[PDB]
Ligand binder design. Structure first.
Ligand SMILES: Nc1ncnc2c1ncn2[C@@H]1O[C@H](COP(=O)(O)OP(=O)(O)O)[C@@H](O)[C@H]1O
Ligand SMILES: Nc1ncnc2c1ncn2[C@@H]1O[C@H](COP(=O)(O)OP(=O)(O)O)[C@@H](O)[C@H]1O
Ligand SMILES: Nc1ncnc2c1ncn2[C@@H]1O[C@H](COP(=O)(O)OP(=O)(O)O)[C@@H](O)[C@H]1O
Ligand SMILES: Nc1ncnc2c1ncn2[C@@H]1O[C@H](COP(=O)(O)OP(=O)(O)O)[C@@H](O)[C@H]1O
Lengths: 76, 438, 219, 219, 76, 438
């Protein structure tokens, strides 16, 4: 369960199994108008940019907690 | 009472914007990692924070740093109320101004040095009237949120306009300095600190209870350890953290005075404390005032010891005064001080382990920009047999080396460094190496 | 003169005060440190005054706490002002007429602590040794110090008595306090609801448990 | 900034008229051994000297004696500017007068004793308003250059007329005694002196910094 | 992801989200000839009987590790 | 390259059937928690185990208990191969027999006491020729798997028939006692043990290297600490764990001998060690053999000290002998012993923390049935200033109290307890309390 925030601050919710590649999450954000190219997926506490993490790695391996709030910012 | 009520506890994570709860409690309250929460405290003060989960956190407790506690005007052991705040809007404009004391001497663009990287991609929840602390350039600056876009709360998000008007505000009477010493400045004495905490809890935080009960609270606490172990720190922290009046007696100072002026000053200290109770008196270098009768050559000295004994004995239980004193070993001091009424409790603050050394190093590098090459663990490991004071000095020496090196390169038009250049200056591992090698 | 010799915390001050109360006698406390804190003659004046006051409100018991402070051996007595005070005390003791109806009780660690002149015929001519108590005595002491306390059924004061080898009264008394305060501390967490800093009632509802004693014994 | 800026360092050679640079720096600045150089310092003070090469001299540093430093009103660790001064003309007439303090008790012809052998075949560059130090007869005398033939600079060459008018000048407030003790008077404690130097650098030479930072300097 | 072993020692695999009640797992075993009444679901390292755990609790709350091997034994 | 090869490391989990890997490595090898794995070791020995994930486990390492290591005939730091073994069938019939030494005096039905609860609902993978260890009734019994249903491997599952024929097998020469001391029997000296481990690694485990290189390995290690800190334990463990010959010299023993017999015995010890190298000599109570020259009254004593110095000096680097010695403080012993060639390394084995005390208590209650009321943490906390020996004795005293209480109830026809009743007997917290109170 990941809660992703649009740059306008609207929550987007979806559940993925930990076995799911990070790409699955990328596709989910790619569903809305948030391409990997144009938008970054940020984590806070800890502070990291999931965008640049390897898509093939499992959600467990990308060290995403069972619950994580994430944020979207334009890669400008 | 209601499960939204929790007990304020110390913070594992030192981030200003973070509070911690047990997962059980988070589940019970239906809280998601990173959810903005609204906390209510005394003087009807409020604060907004990010919630995370701490394994160690007892279900009935909340962990918050001292920034939050101050904003909520609560102290450790107080109760707060937690409710969700999902109505958090990425606010447009915030206006923040520094408190005067914190910025004395600082001559930078506070935005670039402090504010910008604080807020940057942090998505920090802020409330109006909050005071937050940013560390850098070997200082820590306190800023108050004077105005926010949505009036109550806001999330400072990338596009949030941060404005500093550039007029340093005064400190209101209820506002406490974050430059005051607290438990967060003490590393390595976890268990000892815990004991002292328990000792002073009821007498300092719940004095009234002693009117209702006939049980006698501990009057004297003796802190024994080698020099530089942080005995003075502990006392001051406990005072600050419990909000108790702190009176310092320094052995040398007392003994510098002539004849009765010594004993007068002693009495005065006690009287003053009695008056501003609940209070902690701290006697630094107790061995100076009260050595053993063997080592006590001369009658004036014996008079002073005697006075102290009487003063201690004369402390009524209802006085709500705890006396803490520091010495090297119990064998240093007249054994009469360890009688029933007097220093009846001893805590041993000893040399720290590597783990403790690391915490101490961390504490003393908190306002410093450290290059990536810095391995504080290495430093911790190699600094066998070092006490806090040693480590603190090591950090200083490293900083000053760094400055020294840069001051040579500022041979161009650049001024005596600056707040900015100080903030741009990184202490490197080589700097630590120089210090360790010296 | 009665000299009460024993280690600290054995209840020498208690004994004196009790005897005074139980016999209905005026009690004047002289505390060594207090006397010695005073300057020059103020010491000796206070000494005289104590004796005079006692004489007046007789029958009376004077109790000298920490006699070793006022009157160490001549070896350990460095300096003349100190010797003057010892001397004064001797004279004061000697000056007590039989008709004065004053008993002087004094406490010290060992007879070797104090100037032997104090043990002369007229002066502290009687010694009683208040020593470390046996388990039986420890139990009595524990009982005394838990009399105003609500103790859960789990509390085994005999256990506490047994394990508290080499403890004096003061130790035991403190143990009881520490247990109480732990109990209070635990409850103060649960009073996070609306209740004030406990209350007479909640204090009365609060039971000290064996775990509370355990915490204390373990500390 | 510009490579002409260097950091004032201690002097290996104690000759008043000598400054030392790394060969690299000399090459970089196109300087030849013995070239007269013009040095600029604080209070818009100036000095002219002979440049030589020191292996030990760090490229960013210049070595000058205390005479020069005083003339440039700089201290060790300050920055100075070096430019060539090839327009050095063997000046005709210079006028030098001793400072009063230095000549108290001295009753010679200052020329023959001090001035003559100082300048003799030295071809020393001098500037007006310079104070130089001549050592001899178990004393050291400070002379100020009151007038030079070419007004700014001059080289005192054999035919240069050296004139002493014989009125000892007073010492101005900014002028420091070369009879004061300095590092040049301390031998044997190189490493220890270096440590102490570092210790006192920031607190003594850059006090302001401690207003901006929370680091505690050695007390 | 849980690998459940039949009393004959045949591995059965299924993935459930941690949010799923333990009942979901019970139904899965109830799909095969393994009723809650007739069969127990045991855990090893640690040793516990999941059968008796509360079905309404989340798989996270029943402290079932992201991967767990489980075994079936007749409640006889 | 090949990733199936891993380095044998100590075990966090003491279950005989468990090995631990980093999750990375498990993922890399496609291993699921609980998957039976086949491990290959030296002498072409094999073992089957359950894999789990340890955070602390380095990716290139495997954690296995001493049971497994012995079965694989490997030592700590050796390399093993791991392959999955999914073809493991719940076997029907297994046949297990105890080793003679372990069962001397034991008079129970080994099945009910040891075997039954070991295997019960454990679903333990077993291989033929495996020796496993079951702890109980204040003993630990070693059983060998003589036959299994499927010849190689089997899972002992509920319906698995477990048969014990009741003829105790002999111990083969390659089979090492699990009653021998190892690192697993040492609690509280983590860091010190680690240092000693490193010191002896190359000289004891890789002696050959010293033929090829001119670097000098450490010859003498001095273990300084108060009595009962486990100095003798450490030495013996290191010997066992590195597979080195252990020769004990006990100061008192040496000093009991007359004149030359002392020095002869000393020489003999050294010679014997030289011969069975790689070897560790341990000198217990070194202060007895070699006090300071002040305290050394009499010439025969000085001769012995001298002998020892020469003996130490006479150790050639190629001898592959490390000398470990125990004393209270360095000031106890003649300073000559601390010269370059001699005891040039010191490790301080000190009084343990509560954490260490807990480990020690755990070690000493491993063969004991402890009631649920037992709180070893409590015991650990209250046993301030206790060394290992103190704790060990406390555990004994508690056991014996328990036995004493039961022996009163065995006033019926029952014999002096029994292996069974001993196994049924639980030590209670009250038993510990009695001990602590004594
Ligand atoms: N445990 C500690 N953690 C962090 N800093 C410490 C500690 N002990 C000492 N220090 C540092 O050393 C300084 C001096 O220690 P101080 O409080 O005077 O201790 P002591 O009373 O033993 O001399 C402190 O201000 C702090 O900088
Ligand atoms: N025998 C005893 N019975 C009860 N309480 C005792 C006893 N001995 C000591 N105490 C406790 O210890 C305290 C300190 O002892 P105190 O009466 O001052 O005698 P001392 O002069 O030996 O210290 C007493 O007031 C009481 O609280
Ligand atoms: N290292 C040195 N270099 C030069 N002169 C020295 C040195 N050490 C001592 N002296 C001389 O010896 C005298 C005594 O020096 P002083 O500073 O009083 O030494 P201290 O303080 O050690 O007694 C000084 O007048 C100085 O001339
Ligand atoms: N760190 C420890 N871990 C486990 N047992 C210990 C430890 N220290 C002491 N012991 C116990 O105490 C006994 C005595 O230890 P020993 O090696 O003789 O210590 P020392 O050499 O210091 O006298 C050991 O058999 C062991 O059971």
């Amino acid at each position: 369960k990941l809660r992703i925030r649009t740059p306008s601050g609207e929550f987007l919710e979806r559940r993925f199994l930990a076995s799911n590649k990070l790409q699955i999450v990328f596709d989910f954000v790619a569903s809305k108008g948030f391409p990997w190219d144009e938008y970054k997926l940020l984590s806070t506490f800890p502070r990291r940019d999931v965008t640049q993490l390897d898509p093939n790695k499992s959600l467990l391996e990308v060290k995403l907690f069972p619950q994580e709030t994430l944020f979207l910012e334009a890669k400008e | 009472n209601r499960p939204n009520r929790l007990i304020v506890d110390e913070a594992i994570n030192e981030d200003n914007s973070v509070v911690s709860l047990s997962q059980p409690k988070m589940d019970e309250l239906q809280l998601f990692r990173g959810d903005t929460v609204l906390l209510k405290g005394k003087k009807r003060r409020e604060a907004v924070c990010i919630v995370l989960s701490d394994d160690t956190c007892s279900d009935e407790k909340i962990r918050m740093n001292r920034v939050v506690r101050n904003n909520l005007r609560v102290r450790l052991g107080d109760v707060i109320s937690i409710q969700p705040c999902p109505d958090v809007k990425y606010g447009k404009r915030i206006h923040v101004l520094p408190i005067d004391d914190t910025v004395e001497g600082i001559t930078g663009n506070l935005f670039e040095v402090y504010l910008k990287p604080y807020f940057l991609e942090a998505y920090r929840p802020i409330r109006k009237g909050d005071i937050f602390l940013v560390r850098g350039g070997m200082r820590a600056v306190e800023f108050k949120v004077v105005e926010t876009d949505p009036s109550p709360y806001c999330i400072v998000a990338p596009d949030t306009v941060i404005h500093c008007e550039g007029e340093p505000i005064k400190r209101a009477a209820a506002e406490e300095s974050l430059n005051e010493v607290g438990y967060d400045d003490i590393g390595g004495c976890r268990k000892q600190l815990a004991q002292i905490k328990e000792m002073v809890e009821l007498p300092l935080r719940h004095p009234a209870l002693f009117k209702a009960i006939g049980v006698k609270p501990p009057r004297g606490i003796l802190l024994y350890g080698p020099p530089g172990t942080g005995k003075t720190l502990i006392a001051r922290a406990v005072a600050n953290e419990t909000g108790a009046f702190f009176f310092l007696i320094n052995g040398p100072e007392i003994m510098s005075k002539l004849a009765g002026e010594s004993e007068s000053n002693l009495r005065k200290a006690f009287e003053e404390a009695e008056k501003n109770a609940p209070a902690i008196i701290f006697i630094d270098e107790l061995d100076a005032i009260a050595p053993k009768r063997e080592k006590t050559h001369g009658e004036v000295e014996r008079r002073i010891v005697s006075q102290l004994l009487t003063l201690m004995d004369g402390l009524k239980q209802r006085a709500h005064v705890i006396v803490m004193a520091a010495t090297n070993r119990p064998n240093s001091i007249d054994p009469a001080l360890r009688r029933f009424g007097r220093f009846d409790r001893e805590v041993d603050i000893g040399i720290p382990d590597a783990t403790g050394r690391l915490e101490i190093l961390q504490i003393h590098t908190k306002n410093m920009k450290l290059a990536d090459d810095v391995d504080l663990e290495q430093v911790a490991n190699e600094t066998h047999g070092h006490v806090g004071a040693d480590l603190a000095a090591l950090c200083s020496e490293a900083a000053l080396q760094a400055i020294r090196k840069k001051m040579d390169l500022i041979d161009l038009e650049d001024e005596t460094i600056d707040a900015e250049v100080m903030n741009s200056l990184a202490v490197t591992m080589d700097d630590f190496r120089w210090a360790l090698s010296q």
